[PDB]
């Protein structure tokens, strides 16, 4: 039977300072016991000083990031180029993820 999910491995890490924040992630991409790429980035600048990463199943991770980047674009169009605040981005991502509650994005997301 066809299994729609996979595990692309890797790990990510976010830390917040007083006047800054970091989002780190390794560049390795794998399937089972093979390496697919030694340099495949999964931490992205999404605009409005928001960095994002969706680690787990890379297909679902890329799909989510792509949708969020697109969400930021349409937020500008619909609300007079207003800057999307980090708290507003987070809530927007909740609705993206929960929209697929019964066929989930297999990822642990950090912004």
């Amino acid at each position: 039977q066809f299994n729609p999910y996979g595990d692309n491995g890797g790990t990510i890490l976010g830390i917040a300072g007083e006047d800054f924040a970091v989002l780190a992630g390794d560049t390795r991409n794998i399937t089972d016991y093979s390496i697919n790429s030694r340099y495949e980035p999964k931490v992205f600048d999404c605009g409005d000083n928001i960095v994002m990463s969706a680690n787990g199943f890379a297909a679902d991770g890329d799909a989510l990031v792509k949708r969020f980047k697109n969400s930021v674009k349409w937020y500008h169009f619909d609300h007079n180029d207003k800057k999307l605040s980090i708290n507003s981005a987070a809530r927007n991502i909740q609705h993206l993820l929960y929209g697929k509650r019964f066929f989930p994005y297999y990822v642990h997301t950090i912004i």
């Binding site: 792509k66 697109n70 674009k73 169009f77």
Partner: protein, 231 residues
Amino acid sequence: NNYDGDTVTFSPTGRLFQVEYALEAIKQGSVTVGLRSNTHAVLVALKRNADELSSYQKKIIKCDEHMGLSLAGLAPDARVLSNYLRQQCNYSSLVFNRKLAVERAGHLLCDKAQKNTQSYGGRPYGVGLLIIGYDKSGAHLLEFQPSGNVTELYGTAIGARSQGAKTYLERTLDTFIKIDGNPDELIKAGVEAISQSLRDESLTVDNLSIAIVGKDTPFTIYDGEAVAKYI
């Protein structure tokens, strides 16, 4: 007369009057100018107000990082068509990782406007658009009419008294086409062009609206104190 009840009816001379009446709404609209060089493309729009207490109706809309238009006529119809363009530009990016060619943008608007002129119940769009953009084949300027007719041009103008600016650009053709690598001078030529369509009123700080796109310039709009430089 008897053949202007709806868009589905031809006149005895082969005319679509509802399309011509939609064309008339553009002539009533405020003037807007478009012009380009080889490196940049510029939109200049005269905004209109209800009275001194009101704001000035925004004429220019952004579609993507590399494309946008100015409007003249029914503003809600411009919002529908610009929204459609935003989606088509966006579809090209997400699916093909490809910036939508300005020529294809025109083709898509033409086909959208056409379907409204051949079916019962619907109506033609009541707005004209001037699309500028920079893509893989350089700078572009389009003129959209709600009949469906889209035209690629070096420069043009639509709205009330647009013939003044259109004549000026027809004279200045050889000059402004070679304003390469100089944004401010191309805008100046556009501001001087729209000035040929002015009567009694002059260009003030909250009246003028300018937009630009080019080689190393995303589509950006200038209003308020940012256009004071060009008065």
